[PDB]
Scaffold this motif. Structure first.
Motif, mmCIF file in Angstrom:
data_model
loop_
_atom_site.group_PDB
_atom_site.id
_atom_site.type_symbol
_atom_site.label_atom_id
_atom_site.label_comp_id
_atom_site.label_asym_id
_atom_site.label_seq_id
_atom_site.Cartn_x
_atom_site.Cartn_y
_atom_site.Cartn_z
ATOM 1 N N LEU A 139 0.842 -1.189 0.000
ATOM 2 C CA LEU A 139 0.000 0.000 0.000
ATOM 3 C C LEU A 139 0.877 1.238 0.000
ATOM 4 O O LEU A 139 1.822 1.343 0.776
ATOM 5 C CB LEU A 139 -0.932 0.020 1.207
ATOM 6 C CG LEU A 139 -1.678 1.329 1.488
ATOM 7 C CD1 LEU A 139 -2.958 1.390 0.659
ATOM 8 C CD2 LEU A 139 -1.966 1.484 2.987
ATOM 9 N N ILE A 140 0.561 2.172 -0.886
ATOM 10 C CA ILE A 140 1.259 3.445 -0.951
ATOM 11 C C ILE A 140 0.281 4.527 -0.469
ATOM 12 O O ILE A 140 -0.797 4.753 -1.066
ATOM 13 C CB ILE A 140 1.781 3.750 -2.396
ATOM 14 C CG1 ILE A 140 2.376 2.486 -3.027
ATOM 15 C CG2 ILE A 140 2.810 4.869 -2.385
ATOM 16 C CD1 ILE A 140 3.622 1.981 -2.313
ATOM 17 N N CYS A 141 0.651 5.147 0.648
ATOM 18 C CA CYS A 141 -0.197 6.106 1.343
ATOM 19 C C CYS A 141 0.402 7.473 1.110
ATOM 20 O O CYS A 141 1.403 7.825 1.721
ATOM 21 C CB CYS A 141 -0.283 5.783 2.846
ATOM 22 S SG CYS A 141 -1.468 6.808 3.790
ATOM 23 N N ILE A 142 -0.214 8.237 0.220
ATOM 24 C CA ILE A 142 0.439 9.391 -0.377
ATOM 25 C C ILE A 142 -0.005 10.742 0.178
ATOM 26 O O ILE A 142 -1.203 11.057 0.177
ATOM 27 C CB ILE A 142 0.200 9.413 -1.901
ATOM 28 C CG1 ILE A 142 0.659 8.094 -2.539
ATOM 29 C CG2 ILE A 142 0.883 10.617 -2.515
ATOM 30 C CD1 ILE A 142 0.086 7.861 -3.940
ATOM 31 N N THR A 196 -11.340 6.352 6.845
ATOM 32 C CA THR A 196 -11.192 5.253 5.909
ATOM 33 C C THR A 196 -9.724 4.975 5.611
ATOM 34 O O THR A 196 -9.309 3.819 5.580
ATOM 35 C CB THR A 196 -11.958 5.523 4.608
ATOM 36 O OG1 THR A 196 -13.354 5.619 4.902
ATOM 37 C CG2 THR A 196 -11.748 4.397 3.615
ATOM 38 N N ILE A 197 -8.929 6.023 5.421
ATOM 39 C CA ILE A 197 -7.523 5.818 5.084
ATOM 40 C C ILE A 197 -6.735 5.314 6.307
ATOM 41 O O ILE A 197 -5.826 4.479 6.171
ATOM 42 C CB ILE A 197 -6.882 7.110 4.503
ATOM 43 C CG1 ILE A 197 -5.578 6.792 3.769
ATOM 44 C CG2 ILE A 197 -6.658 8.171 5.571
ATOM 45 C CD1 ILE A 197 -4.973 8.003 3.095
ATOM 46 N N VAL A 198 -7.097 5.792 7.499
ATOM 47 C CA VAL A 198 -6.467 5.284 8.718
ATOM 48 C C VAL A 198 -6.779 3.793 8.873
ATOM 49 O O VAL A 198 -5.877 2.995 9.143
ATOM 50 C CB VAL A 198 -6.913 6.067 9.979
ATOM 51 C CG1 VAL A 198 -6.541 5.299 11.249
ATOM 52 C CG2 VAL A 198 -6.256 7.435 10.005
ATOM 53 N N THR A 224 -4.815 1.742 6.072
ATOM 54 C CA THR A 224 -3.394 1.684 6.376
ATOM 55 C C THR A 224 -3.128 0.747 7.556
ATOM 56 O O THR A 224 -2.220 -0.099 7.502
ATOM 57 C CB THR A 224 -2.847 3.067 6.694
ATOM 58 O OG1 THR A 224 -3.133 3.957 5.609
ATOM 59 C CG2 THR A 224 -1.348 3.018 6.909
ATOM 60 N N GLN A 225 -3.919 0.900 8.619
ATOM 61 C CA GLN A 225 -3.796 0.019 9.782
ATOM 62 C C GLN A 225 -3.972 -1.443 9.383
ATOM 63 O O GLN A 225 -3.183 -2.289 9.775
ATOM 64 C CB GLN A 225 -4.814 0.384 10.861
ATOM 65 C CG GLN A 225 -4.631 -0.410 12.145
ATOM 66 C CD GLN A 225 -5.678 -0.093 13.201
ATOM 67 O OE1 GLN A 225 -6.355 0.934 13.145
ATOM 68 N NE2 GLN A 225 -5.821 -0.991 14.169
ATOM 69 N N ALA A 226 -4.996 -1.727 8.582
ATOM 70 C CA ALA A 226 -5.265 -3.090 8.143
ATOM 71 C C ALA A 226 -4.072 -3.668 7.379
ATOM 72 O O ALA A 226 -3.648 -4.802 7.622
ATOM 73 C CB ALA A 226 -6.518 -3.133 7.291
ATOM 74 N N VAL A 282 4.064 1.870 2.501
ATOM 75 C CA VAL A 282 4.947 3.016 2.320
ATOM 76 C C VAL A 282 4.167 4.308 2.534
ATOM 77 O O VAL A 282 3.159 4.551 1.868
ATOM 78 C CB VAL A 282 5.597 3.036 0.917
ATOM 79 C CG1 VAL A 282 6.578 4.181 0.799
ATOM 80 C CG2 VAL A 282 6.310 1.703 0.631
ATOM 81 N N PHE A 283 4.637 5.122 3.476
ATOM 82 C CA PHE A 283 4.143 6.475 3.648
ATOM 83 C C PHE A 283 4.980 7.353 2.748
ATOM 84 O O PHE A 283 6.104 7.698 3.085
ATOM 85 C CB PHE A 283 4.230 6.931 5.119
ATOM 86 C CG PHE A 283 3.326 6.155 6.050
ATOM 87 C CD1 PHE A 283 3.773 4.988 6.658
ATOM 88 C CD2 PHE A 283 2.024 6.584 6.302
ATOM 89 C CE1 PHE A 283 2.940 4.270 7.507
ATOM 90 C CE2 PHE A 283 1.187 5.873 7.150
ATOM 91 C CZ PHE A 283 1.648 4.710 7.756
#
Ligand SMILES: [Zn+2]
Ligand SMILES: [Zn+2]
Lengths: 183, 183
Positions: free
Chosen positions: A5-8, A33-35, A38-40, A49-50
């Motif tokens: 997952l790429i968290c941009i 939703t994004i938290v 990402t947690q999942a 990747v942040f």
């Protein structure tokens, strides 16, 4: 397949009310939703990747310095991850499957070692979340497409200031890039 | 500074009425402007690349193969440059500053030797025209941006089958990518 997952660019400057370049309400709307996404990913052991826009204060050589006010400056609160994402990261920042990656263009691939890391881990499916749908998420997706990755866009974990750009982008992802657009 | 023109996918299949993937009238509407532009570049002695989608429709390994009808197939008249662009090219194709370059993804850079050729010629400014504004032109501009070129988009020499995508793309080029959008 193996996933990453790429968290941009989910920073203060891009989401906060007085964000130096804030996208406003749509950006804050996706916080939960994004938290959760990402947690999942982190807890399931997938690569996370942040990917975070990173700017020095004195840099007249950066292209964006022509176009934008100072933002996501190294060491400032604006660059910090927005809302409940900041503690999530803080909790997991030592994990092996967590990477904090500073980037200097919209695409998470450009001038970074993202592809190196992804190939090392034999990752074949890239999930995208963050801001903006039609800028950093888009450019990242374009690079990912051209680099042969399968692509998943999490449409409730991306946002843009421009609603029409958001819509356009989701359609581009489905119809041109042939990505999966997931709810 | 040194200039080049990338003339993208202005073919029958993308512009003619019976074209396999036609943008219809908007694509035809730019014929005079794009032919004038291209001729001006050629006659002025600047570098000109006709960047043309070239598919083997027989390749299930290609991402587009099953998800788009056969278009710009080698040997077919659908691959021929549209209208008066075709005799212009035929008149100048021998010239040192004219290059015909086949491509297999949306971006003119992806898997091609475009960048090699631009570096050799010390090109610093990249002018883009052709089809579609929000697909091949867009992907080409994303790459050009990340590769550090100055970019000029010729607004009256680009078109899409999607009007909202076209407008979105021009604002993207001007605002995010920092290109000059020339009228
Ligand atoms: Zn920035
Ligand atoms: Zn194609």
């Amino acid at each position: 397949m193996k996933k990453a997952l790429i968290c941009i660019d989910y920073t203060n400057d891009f989401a906060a009310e007085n964000g130096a370049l804030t996208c406003g309400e749509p950006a804050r709307q996706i916080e939960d939703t994004i938290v959760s996404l990402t947690q999942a990913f982190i807890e399931n052991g997938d690569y996370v990747v942040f990917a975070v826009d990173s700017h020095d204060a004195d840099d007249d050589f950066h292209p964006e310095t022509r176009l934008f006010p100072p933002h996501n400056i190294n060491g400032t609160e604006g660059k910090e991850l927005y809302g409940r994402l900041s503690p999530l990261y803080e909790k997991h920042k030592h994990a092996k499957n967590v990477n904090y990656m500073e980037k200097t263009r919209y695409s998470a691939f450009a001038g970074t070692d993202l592809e190196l890391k992804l190939r090392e881990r034999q990752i074949a499916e890239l999930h995208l979340a963050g801001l903006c749908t039609d800028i950093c998420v888009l450019h990242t997706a374009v690079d990912a497409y051209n680099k042969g990755f399968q692509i998943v866009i999490h449409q409730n974990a991306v946002a843009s200031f421009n609603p029409e750009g958001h819509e356009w982008a989701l359609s581009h992802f489905k119809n041109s890039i042939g990505a999966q657009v997931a709810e």
